Amino acid sequence: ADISRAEVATLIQEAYSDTLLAAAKQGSTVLSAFQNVNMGTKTTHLPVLAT
Amino acid sequence: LPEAGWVGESATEPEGVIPTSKVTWANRTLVAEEVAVIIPVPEAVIDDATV
């Protein structure tokens, strides 16, 4: 005598939305606060005044 | 499945009234499952073969 939404099973499809998916990414703090010294080797030596 | 009925021309008798009926559906699923094999062979055997 009547058709309910449970009786129409999967003739009604469920949809998708990525509108919550896109999280923004945060860089390193020290790579923007301080100088980025370019290196071409494992070890660099820096002399400093000590006495 | 719904069921229909024969209906008289009347504005007063119960036989003048068209029956209501429902239709209903259920769900079945295709679920994909993986079948696979690995066939190892010497690279020399593969390089040697003309077929």
Place this chain on the structure above:
Amino acid sequence: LPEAGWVGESATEPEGVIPTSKVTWANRTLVAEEVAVIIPVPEAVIDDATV
């Protein structure tokens, strides 16, 4: 969120192996629901009125 680690150099030690890690996701849903009202009025009242 995934986790990185600091890594040595060796072919033999437990350090020098890069750590494995993981990213995961979850589901949130919009489910539509109906809000409604019926407002009945005599049609003579609609014709009689100045607005």
Place this chain on the structure above:
Amino acid sequence: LGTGENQINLAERDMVALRLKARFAYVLGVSATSVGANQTPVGVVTPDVTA
């Protein structure tokens, strides 16, 4: 509108009605952020029940 003793047949009583309706859903994007898992994006100032 209505049934039994409460019944209004709009056509024969020379009435009309407006049915107003909408369908709405709501979602709150509780998720991970760069600071950690399961972070709620909403806070509240509750009223003063003490001072």
